[PDB]
Amino acid sequence: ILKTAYTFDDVLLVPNKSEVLPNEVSLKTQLTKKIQLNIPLMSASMDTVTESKMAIAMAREGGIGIIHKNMTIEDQAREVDRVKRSGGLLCGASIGVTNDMMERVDAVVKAKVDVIVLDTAHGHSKGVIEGVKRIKAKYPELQVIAGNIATPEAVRDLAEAGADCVKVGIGPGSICTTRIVAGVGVPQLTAVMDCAEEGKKLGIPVIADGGLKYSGDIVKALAAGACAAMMGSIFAGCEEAPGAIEIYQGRSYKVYRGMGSLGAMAKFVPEGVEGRIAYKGHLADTIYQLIGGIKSGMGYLGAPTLENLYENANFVVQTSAGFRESHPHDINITKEAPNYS
Amino acid sequence: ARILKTAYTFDDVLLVPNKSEVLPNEVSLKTQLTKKIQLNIPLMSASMDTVTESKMAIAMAREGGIGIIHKNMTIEDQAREVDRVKRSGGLLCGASIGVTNDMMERVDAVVKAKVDVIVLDTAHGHSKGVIEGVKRIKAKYPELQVIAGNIATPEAVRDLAEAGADCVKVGIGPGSICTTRIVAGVGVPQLTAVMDCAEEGKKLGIPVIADGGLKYSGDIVKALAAGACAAMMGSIFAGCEEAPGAIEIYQGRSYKVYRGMGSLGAMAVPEGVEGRIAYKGHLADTIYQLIGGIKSGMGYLGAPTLENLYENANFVVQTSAGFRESHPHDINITKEAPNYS
Amino acid sequence: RILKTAYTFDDVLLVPNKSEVLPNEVSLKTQLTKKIQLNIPLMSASMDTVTESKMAIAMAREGGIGIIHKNMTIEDQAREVDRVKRSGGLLCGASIGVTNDMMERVDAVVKAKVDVIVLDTAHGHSKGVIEGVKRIKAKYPELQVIAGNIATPEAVRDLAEAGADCVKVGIGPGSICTTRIVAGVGVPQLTAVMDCAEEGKKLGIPVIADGGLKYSGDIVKALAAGACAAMMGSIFAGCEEAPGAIEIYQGRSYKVYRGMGSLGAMAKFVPEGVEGRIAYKGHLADTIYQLIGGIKSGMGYLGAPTLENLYENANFVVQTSAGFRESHPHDINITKEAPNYS
Amino acid sequence: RILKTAYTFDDVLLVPNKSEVLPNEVSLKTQLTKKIQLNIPLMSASMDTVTESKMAIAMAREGGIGIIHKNMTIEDQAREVDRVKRSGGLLCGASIGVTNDMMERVDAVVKAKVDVIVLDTAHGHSKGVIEGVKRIKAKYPELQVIAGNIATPEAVRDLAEAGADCVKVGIGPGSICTTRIVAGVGVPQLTAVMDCAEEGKKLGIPVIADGGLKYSGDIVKALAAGACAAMMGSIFAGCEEAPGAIEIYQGRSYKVYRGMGSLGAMAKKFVPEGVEGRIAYKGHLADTIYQLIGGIKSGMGYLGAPTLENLYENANFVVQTSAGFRESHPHDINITKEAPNYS
Ligand SMILES: C/C(=N\O)c1cccc(C(C)(C)NC(=O)Nc2ccc(Cl)c(-c3nc(C(F)(F)F)cs3)c2)c1
Ligand SMILES: C/C(=N\O)c1cccc(C(C)(C)NC(=O)Nc2ccc(Cl)c(-c3nc(C(F)(F)F)cs3)c2)c1
Ligand SMILES: C/C(=N\O)c1cccc(C(C)(C)NC(=O)Nc2ccc(Cl)c(-c3nc(C(F)(F)F)cs3)c2)c1
Ligand SMILES: C/C(=N\O)c1cccc(C(C)(C)NC(=O)Nc2ccc(Cl)c(-c3nc(C(F)(F)F)cs3)c2)c1
Ligand SMILES: O=c1[nH]cnc2c1ncn2[C@@H]1O[C@H](COP(=O)(O)O)[C@@H](O)[C@H]1O
Ligand SMILES: O=c1[nH]cnc2c1ncn2[C@@H]1O[C@H](COP(=O)(O)O)[C@@H](O)[C@H]1O
Ligand SMILES: O=c1[nH]cnc2c1ncn2[C@@H]1O[C@H](COP(=O)(O)O)[C@@H](O)[C@H]1O
Ligand SMILES: O=c1[nH]cnc2c1ncn2[C@@H]1O[C@H](COP(=O)(O)O)[C@@H](O)[C@H]1O
Ligand SMILES: [K+]
Ligand SMILES: [K+]
C-alpha cells in the first residue's frame, strides 16, 4: 500500500521553450505498426457511441471508430462494410471472447475491417491471451488490439500472445463502476504511463481508453506515451452517435450507458450505469475543439510531433486547491464555451 | 515529529488486477470465521436492533453467512431468538454479549439455546473488562467460540488472542451511524486497521473481522484482500425486509429506521446517531449483488480462493481526483443500478 | 521552502490504547497556570457575544473559567469581575489589550479580585505584547498573566521570558476569523498547539488551545497534543448565559456571534473577523456535560487516568478526506438530534 | 517521471514572525523595473473588462499602475494612454501583442509617453516573444518592457537575455482561464512565482505575480514568494472604474468579466482559452484598494517585515490540507453582515 497513482486531473504539463506555433504541429500517430491515423482519436465500441455513421465521421476527421459488437455478426459485418465502401476509410470492429468469436472475426475480416479490438473487462486473462493467439494463428497479417489492461506485466503477456496494440483502462470510464463494485482499477494516467513505458521497450503501442473529459486530458495521455486516445462520453453526445434523444429543462440529451450496464446487457451483476449527456451537435465541431486543444498544448510544449511531445513533457502534481485554480473559478459563467462545459 | 503515519480507508485505495486464469463464476468464497466455524460466503449481519434478529439471522445463514442477534432485549427474549434460528433447520447463529453484571447469565441462556458463536463487543475491546470477560467465558465454556471486539491495533489482537478469543472484530469509528471519531477523537481508518490487525492475526493464527464502513461490494473485496476472514455490515443490510422494524413511507419512497446502538434511542453521552435508510427489499437480492461484486474482483485479481486473494493483492493509493475518476462521473444517471446507490 | 505540512484537528485521529480505566474513572483536573487549577480544561472566549458575568459565573461553577471581554469600559468590566468573585468564591478572568489605558484597566480588574489576566492581541509575538507583560508583572508580581495569541515555539520562549505564566495558541483557527484569508498568515491549530506545547512544557509554561474547536473529539486532540485547557467561542456562544438577545428566524432561535475584529465588535477599519448567527444551544450546563463526556470517553479509549498521561501516550495518525468522510456519519438520513453532534 | 507537487495560494500559509513593527509603519514600495517605482505593488490587468484610461488613472492615483488593453485600434490605445499622462503625469502601461503591426502599436503608445509596455502572450517563452523583445529594445533601448506570461526559471533567463526589464508569471491561474483544461499546460501559481522569483533575483530582473489572486492574503503570499508586484483582473473587474456599465440581475448589481482568450473577446474557427461571465459589483476602486492594502500591511506586521524585501527574506510557508483550508476560512457560522474584505 505504499505507492500513489495519479489520474489526469492530478497533474499538469510544464510549458517548454517553443519555436513552434500550434497550427504548425502534426498529430500523425501509429495506431499499430501498420495503421497510421492522422489524428490520435478513436471512438469507443459502445452501443451508444459507435456504429457506421459515427465510424465514417471519425475516419474522415483522421481518426477511427470501433464498431461495437452488441448486434448480430451479420449486422456488424454490414456496419463495417458500410464504412469501407464510403471511400477508403479505415474501420475497426469490436470482438469479445465467446463461442461466437471466430465467426464474428471471419465476418468482419471478409467485410474488410482494418483492425479488430478484442476487448474484455479483464484483458490480462487466459481467455484473451488464447483469443489473440487463436486469431493471429488464423489471420497473421490482421491487426489486433487487445484490452483492457492496467499493468506492464499485462503489456508483455499480450505482446507475447501477438497483439499489435494494447488498450489501457480498468475503471476510468465515465459510466464505469468496476472500481466501486469490484474494488479493482488503476488511476488512468499512472496506468498509461507504466504501460506506455513497457510498451516502448517491446515495440508495441498503447491506447488510453476512458476517463478523458477535456482536450487537455488527451494532451496528458499522449505526453504519458499513449499512441491514441479513446472516448465514449466525449463523442456520445454527438449527432452521429446512436442514442435516443431525451428532453429535460430546455435541453436535448443523448442516452449514454456502460456496455456492462443492465440495459446494455439486455441476475445481472452490472459494472456500469445508464444515463444521458447533453446533445453536442455534429462530431466535426467537437473534433475541431479537441484537436485545437491538443495543438495548443503541443505549442506550449514546443513539440512539432507526438513523439517530441512524449520525450519533452514534464509533469507536476497539483493539489485539490491547484485543481480549483486550474478550472475557471469565482466567475458566474453566462456564455457557453465550445471548449468548456 | 509526532504526526507521521497516514492511515487509509477503502476509498483511498484500489486493487491492481493480476493475471487471471480464472473466471468470477469459479471462485470459492468459503471462509473460516473461527477454526470450528466455516461460512460459505464471508459476510455477517451486524449486532444491532435495526439489523439482526431471528428473521435476519435465519436469512443470513440460509445465504451462507451468519447473523449475530443483538443484546438490546431481555435475556429471555435473546435466548428465544437464538432458538428460533437453531430450530429453523441446522443454521449457524451468533449472539452478542456485553460486559455486564448479568453477563454469564446471558452466555448461559444463549448457550442453552445452542448458539454457535458469541460476540463480546464493546466500544473499546482492547480493555480490562473485555480481557477478563473472554477469559471468564473461556473458563466456563472452553468449547465455545468467542469473537471479541472492537479493536484497531496489532497490540489489541495479541492481548485478545492471549486471553482466549477465537476471532477479533476490527473497527473503531468507521460505522455509518458512528460518531466515536467526532465525540471522542479516536479511531483508525478501517482499511489500515484491518490491514495492521490482519497481519498480527495471521502470524498468531487468529482471524479478524472487518466491521463497519463498508458500503459497496468493492469495499468488501478490499477488506478481504487486506486479510480479514469476513465482513460485518449494518447499513448494507438494515434496509432489507428481514431487518426488524416496519417500513415508513416518506415522500413516495420507502424507508426503514437505522440507528447506532450508541445512539440515544437504542440506549433507551452517545456515540452514534439515529436515522432512516432506504428500503432495499429482500436480503437475497442484496446478497446476490454483493456476492457477484466480490467474485468479479477476485476474477480481476486471479484468485480462486480468499487466501490466494490476500497472498497476491497489490494496493495503490488514489487521490481525491482518482476517487472522482473511480466513480461514475460527468454523466446524468437516469436508471438506478442494483449495486450502485 | 514550502515543504513542511501542518495539520489541524480534522486531519488526525487518536489510535486507541489498552485501557484499564473506565470513562467515569478518569480525572480532568488541569493546571491553567502554576497558581490556578481547574476541575475541567474548558475556557469561554474573551468575546462580547460569549463571556460576561453570567457566562463566567456559569463556567466557574462547572469547573472551568470565563474570561470577561474588553469591549466595555473599565468601570463596567471591573464590576463584571466583581459580579463573579462575589458569587460564592469563583475564579474569574479578564481581557486586556495593548492600549494606552492598559494599566488602568489592569488596576481596576485587580482591585475587583480578578484571578487571571489575558493580554490577548492579534499578534502576541510582538514588541507591544512583550513589553506589556513585562510592565504588568513588574507592577503585580503575583498576578497570573496569560499572553497571546501565538503559533510558534519561538513565541512561547519569548513570552515566557517576558514573564507570562501561560500562553494562548491560535492564529486563524477561529470559526469567525478571517486573519488567514486577509493577511495570509497562520498555522493549522493542531500543529500549532503541538509545537508550542512542546516548548512550553520544557520551560514549564502551560499553553491554551484557543479556537477552531467544534466537537468534543477536537478538545481531546488538543489535550493529547499537550494543551492545558481549551478555549471555545462558537461552542458557548449559543448558550443562555452568553450575552445578546435571542433573534428568531423562521421558527428557529439563534444568537449573534461575531469576531472581535469584525466591523460589528470594533464599532477605515480593515476587519479580520466576520459577524453572524448560530443556533440557540440551551443552558451551558448541558453543553458542558456533553463536552466532558466526550473527553472522558476519549481518555477511556486511550487508557489515560489524567490529562498528563494522555499527552504522553497519545499516538496520532493522519486521515485523508475519505477517512474524514468515514469518521463522520455517512449515508444516513439523520432524523433525530444527537445532543453532541451537528 | 511524476514526482514534484506544485502549490498554489490556497495550499499554504505564512508563519508569523517575531514583530517589532505595526501595520501602519510598513512600507509597500516596490521596483516594477529598475526605472519604475510603485507606491503600492498592485497592477490592473490588460483586459477589455478591467482596464482602460479611467481605471489606469484610478490605479495610478492609488500608487499602482494599470495596463490599458490592446483590444482596440492603435490610435485608440495611444489616445487612451495619452488620457492618463494628461491627468497629472500619472504612470501608464500598454499591452502589446506579437502582431504584424507590433512595432506600429509600440510607436503610437511611445509617442503618447507610455511608461512601460507589456508584451503579453499565451506563451511568453516562445520565439515570437523572444524576438519581439529584442526588436523593441533595439529601437527603443530605454523603453521599459515587461514580457510574459511564463512559469519556469528557464523562461525568466531567456527573456532577460532578450532584454526584458521585468517578466510576468502565470500560465493558467486566471479565474476566467481554461488553458490548463483545454491545453493541459500550466504551473500552480505559488510554486511558479517562487521558482521564477528565485531565478529573477539571481539575474537582477523582477517578476510579476499575475492571475489567480482572490483575497488580500493571497497577495501577501505572492509577495513573500518574491514577486515585485501583483496583477489582478477579477478583483478589479467588479469596480465602477472598469469598462462596461453596471448590470442588474435579480435585484443585485453585476459587471461583465471575461477572458481575453474567450469567444466574445476574440470576436467558429476559434478555440478559446477563457470564459465569459459576470461578477458582483463591488463599488469604487478606492475602497477595494484600501481593503487590499490593509490586508498586506496586516500580513507584513504579522511577519515583522517593514519592507517587501524583508518580507521575502524571512517568510516561512507551511502547507495546509483541505481540512486546514476549511479551518482557515470562516466555518460553522451563518454570516449575517457583509465583511468588506471577505465574500
Ligand atoms: C468493460 C467492462 N468492464 O470493465 C464490462 C463490459 C461488459 C460486461 C461487463 C460485466 C458486467 C459482464 N462484467 C464482467 O465481465 N466482469 C468481469 C470481472 C472479472 C473477470 Cl476476470 C472478467 C472476465 N471475463 C472474461 C471473458 F473471458 F469472459 F471475457 C475474461 S476475464 C469479467 C463488464
Ligand atoms: C483577534 C484579532 N485578530 O486575530 C483581532 C481582534 C480585534 C481587532 C483586530 C484587528 C482587526 C485590529 N487586526 C489587527 O489587530 N491586526 C494586526 C495584524 C498584525 C499585527 Cl503585527 C498586529 C498587532 N497588534 C498589536 C497590538 F499592539 F495591538 F497588540 C501588536 S502587532 C495586529 C484583530
Ligand atoms: C460501539 C459503540 N461505540 O463505538 C457503543 C455502543 C453502545 C453504547 C456506546 C456508548 C454510547 C454507551 N459509549 C461507550 O460505551 N463509550 C465508551 C467510551 C470509552 C470506553 Cl474505555 C468504554 C468502555 N466500556 C467498556 C465496558 F464497560 F463496556 F466494558 C469497556 S471500555 C466505552 C458505544
Ligand atoms: C492568455 C491567453 N491564454 O493563456 C490568451 C489570450 C488571448 C488569446 C489566446 C488564445 C485563445 C488565442 N490562445 C492562444 O494564443 N494559445 C496559444 C497556445 C500555444 C502557443 Cl505556443 C501560442 C502562441 N502564440 C504566439 C503568437 F502568435 F501570439 F506569437 C506565439 S506562441 C498560443 C490565449
Ligand atoms: O459498463 C462498463 N463498465 C466499465 N467500463 C466500460 C463500460 N462500458 C464501457 N466501458 C469503457 O469505458 C470507456 C469509455 O469511457 P469514457 O470516455 O470516459 O466515457 C470505453 O472505452 C470502455 O473502455
Ligand atoms: O452507536 C454506534 N456507535 C459506533 N459504532 C457503532 C454503533 N452502533 C454500531 N456500531 C458499529 O458499527 C457497525 C455498523 O456499521 P456500518 O456497517 O457502517 O453501518 C456495527 O457493526 C458496529 O460494529
Ligand atoms: O475577529 C476575530 N478575528 C480573528 N480571531 C478572532 C476574532 N475574534 C475572536 N477570535 C479568536 O477566535 C476564538 C474563538 O474561536 P471559535 O471558538 O472557533 O469560534 C477566540 O477565542 C479568539 O481567540
Ligand atoms: O482568456 C484567457 N485565458 C487565459 N488567461 C487569461 C485570459 N484572459 C486573461 N488571462 C490572464 O488572467 C489574468 C486575470 O486573472 P484573475 O486575476 O484571476 O482574474 C490576467 O492578468 C491575464 O494574465
Ligand atoms: K484557471
Ligand atoms: K478561520
Three-state DSSP string of chain D: CCCCECCCHHHEEECCCCECCCHHHCCCCEEEECCEEECCCEEECCCCCCCCHHHHHHHHCCCCEEEECCCCCHHHHHHHHHHHHHCCCCCCEEEECCCCCHHHHHHHHHHCCCCEEEEECCCCCEHHHHHHHHHHHHHCCCCEEEEEEECCHHHHHHHHHHCCCEEEECCCCCCCECHHHHCCECCCHHHHHHHHHHHHHHHCCCEEEECCCCCHHHHHHHHHCCCCEEEECHHHHCECCCCCCCEEECCEEEEEEECCCCHHHHCCCCCCCECEEEEECCECHHHHHHHHHHHHHHHHHHCCCCCHHHHHHHCCEEEECHHHHHHHCCCCCEEEECECCEC
CA end-to-end span of chain B, whole Å?
41
CA end-to-end span of chain D, whole Å?
40
DSSP-H helix ranges across chain B: 54-63, 75-86, 103-112, 128-140, 154-161, 180-183, 190-204, 217-226, 235-238, 283-301, 306-311, 320-326
Contacts of A24 (CB under 8 A, 6+ apart): A299, A304
CATH number of this structure's domain D1-343: 3.20.20.70
> Any chain A CB within 8 A of the CB of D191?
yes
- What is the H or E stretch that residue A30 is in? strand A29-30
Nearest partner of C297 among B266, D82, B272, judged by Cα:
B272
Q: What is the DSSP string of A10-22?
A: GEEEPP--B---G
Interatomic CA distance for residues D143 and D94, integer angstroms: 12
Residue whose entry in the numeric block shows the C-alpha cell 520544557: C202
CA angle A321, B331, A287 (to 5 degrees): 85
The bridge status of strand B253-259 relative to strand B274-278 is antiparallel
Q: What is the arrangement of strands in the sheet containing C275-279, beginning at the earlier edge strand?
A: C246-249, C252-258, C275-279, D334-337
* Cell numbers given for C262: 469584525
> Any chain D CB within 8 A of the CB of A288?
yes
Task: Judge residue C231's burial from the number of C-beta atoms within 10 Å of its C-beta, 0-12 exposed, 13-18 middle, 19 or more buried.
Answer: buried
Backbone gaps in chain A, preceding residues (C–N over 2.5 A): 266
Q: Which of B129, B189, B265 sits opposite C323 (nearest CB)?
A: B189
Interatomic CA distance for residues C136 and C133, integer angstroms: 5
- Kindly indicate whether the domain formed by A1-341 is annotated with CATH number 3.20.20.70: yes
Interatomic CA distance for residues D101 and D70, integer angstroms: 12
Interatomic CA distance for residues B101 and D170, integer angstroms: 69
Cβ atoms D28, D34 nearer than 8 A: no
HSE-up of C23 (CA within 13 Å, CB side)? 16
DSSP collapsed to 3 states, B98-110:
CCCCCHHHHHHHH
* Cell numbers given for C80: 463584571
A199: left (phi over 0), alpha (psi -120 to 50) or beta: alpha
Q: Which amino acid is at D301?
A: G
Q: Which amino acid is at A278?
A: A
Backbone gaps in chain D, preceding residues (C–N over 2.5 A): 267
Are the Cβ atoms of C194 and B264 closer than 8 angstroms? no
Cβ atoms D173, D148 nearer than 8 A: no
Helices D74-86 and D53-60 cross at an angle (nearest 10°) of 30
Cβ atoms A68, A50 nearer than 8 A: yes
Q: How far is CA C32 from CA C39, C167, D154, in A?
A: 10, 10, 55
Question: Which chain C residue's Cα is nearest to D321?
Answer: C7
Nearest partner of A9 among D323, B333, C11, B323, judged by Cα:
B323
Q: Which amino acid is at C251?
A: G
Interatomic CA distance for residues D233 and D215, integer angstroms: 12
Q: How far is CA C120 from CA B71, B90, B239, C47, in A?
A: 52, 71, 53, 11
The finding on whether B210 has its CB within 6 A of some atom of ligand 6 is no
- Range 26-65 of A in CB contact (< 8 A) with D: none
Nearest partner of D56 among D21, D37, D83, judged by Cα:
D83
Q: Name the 3-class secondary structure at A251.
A: strand
Residue whose entry in the numeric block shows the C-alpha cell 476487448: A119
* Cell numbers given for D278: 459576470
DSSP collapsed to 3 states, D256-279:
EEECCCCHHHHCCCCCCCECEEEE
Q: Name the 3-class secondary structure at B122.
A: coil
Interatomic CA distance for residues C307 and D220, integer angstroms: 39
Are the Cβ atoms of D330 and C1 closer than 8 angstroms? no
Question: Which chain B residue's Cα is nearest to C213?
Answer: B182
Alpha carbon D119 to its chain's center: 14
Q: Name the 3-class secondary structure at B118.
A: strand
Q: How far is CA D94 from CA B300, C292, D106, D155, D217, in A?
A: 61, 64, 9, 22, 28
Chain D neighbors (3+ CB pairs < 8 Å): A, C
Q: Please give the sequence-ordered ranges of beta strands (E in DSSP) within A233-309, or none if there are none.
A: 245-248, 251-257, 274-278
Q: What is the DSSP string of B224-272?
A: HHHT-SEEEESHHHHTSTTSSS--EEETTEEEEEEE-TTSTTTT---SB
- What 8-state DSSP symbol labels residue C342? -
- Range 118-137 of A in CB contact (< 8 A) with B: 121-122, 124-127
- What 8-state DSSP symbol labels residue B299? H
Cβ atoms C308, C28 nearer than 8 A: no
HSE-up of B103 (CA within 13 Å, CB side)? 19
Residue whose entry in the numeric block shows the C-alpha cell 506545547: C197
Are the Cβ atoms of B11 and C326 closer than 8 angstroms? yes
Torsion of CA C179, C182, C183, C188, to 10 degrees: 40
Interatomic CA distance for residues D209 and A325, integer angstroms: 14
Chain A neighbors (3+ CB pairs < 8 Å): B, D
Q: Name the 3-class secondary structure at C312.
A: helix
Q: How many other C-beta atoms can be found within 10 angstroms of the C-beta atom of residue C2? A: 18
Residue whose entry in the numeric block shows the C-alpha cell 488551545: C209
Interatomic CA distance for residues B234 and B260, integer angstroms: 9
Contacts of D62 (CB under 8 A, 6+ apart): D39, D40, D42, D285, D286, D289
Q: Name the 3-class secondary structure at B59.
A: helix
* Cell numbers given for A66: 470501433
The finding on whether D23 has its CB within 6 A of some atom of ligand 2 is yes
- Kindly indicate whether the domain formed by C1-342 is annotated with CATH number 1.10.760.10: no
Residues paired with C65 in a beta bridge: C43
HSE-up of C287 (CA within 13 Å, CB side)? 27
Backbone gaps in chain C, preceding residues (C–N over 2.5 A): 267
Interatomic CA distance for residues D83 and B115, integer angstroms: 93
Cβ atoms C96, C119 nearer than 8 A: yes
Distance from CA of B295 to the nearest CA of C (A): 25
Torsion of CA A322, A326, A330, A335, to 10 degrees: -160
Cβ atoms B178, C329 nearer than 8 A: yes
Interatomic CA distance for residues D292 and D339, integer angstroms: 13
Q: Which of D4, D181, D322 sits opposite A327 (nearest CB)?
A: D181
Interatomic CA distance for residues C241 and C227, integer angstroms: 26
Q: What is the arrangement of strands in the sheet containing C5-6, beginning at the earlier edge strand?
A: C5-6, D317-320, D12-14
- What 8-state DSSP symbol labels residue C150? E
Contacts of B291 (CB under 8 A, 6+ apart): B29, B41, B217
The bridge status of strand C316-319 relative to strand C333-334 is unpaired
DSSP collapsed to 3 states, D215-255:
CHHHHHHHHHCCCCEEEECHHHHCECCCCCCCEEECCEEEE
A249: left (phi over 0), alpha (psi -120 to 50) or beta: left
Interatomic CA distance for residues C60 and B146, integer angstroms: 48
CA angle A105, A109, A111 (to 5 degrees): 120
Q: Name the 3-class secondary structure at B45.
A: strand
CA-only gyration radius of chain B, Å: 19
Helices C53-62 and C74-86 cross at an angle (nearest 10°) of 30
Q: Name the 3-class secondary structure at C10.
A: helix
Q: How many other C-beta atoms can be found within 10 angstroms of the C-beta atom of residue B335? A: 12
Per domain, the residue ranges of chain D are 1-343
Interatomic CA distance for residues D303 and D21, integer angstroms: 9
Backbone gaps in chain B, preceding residues (C–N over 2.5 A): 268
- What is the H or E stretch that residue B26 is in? none
Q: Name the 3-class secondary structure at C80.
A: helix
Are the Cβ atoms of C333 and B172 closer than 8 angstroms? no
DSSP-H helix ranges across A162-257: 178-181, 188-202, 215-224, 233-236
Nearest partner of D235 among D309, D149, D173, D297, judged by Cα:
D173
- What 8-state DSSP symbol labels residue A62? T
Cβ atoms A334, D277 nearer than 8 A: yes
Residues paired with B258 in a beta bridge: B275
Contacts of D16 in chain C (CB under 8 A): 123, 125, 150-152, 155, 171, 185-187
Q: Which of B8, B176, B269 sits opposite C290 (nearest CB)?
A: B269
Residue whose entry in the numeric block shows the C-alpha cell 529584442: D134
Helices D216-224 and D285-302 cross at an angle (nearest 10°) of 50
Phi then psi dihedrals of residue B172, to 5 deg: -115, 105
Q: How far is CA B316 from CA B78, B319, B324, in A?
A: 44, 10, 15
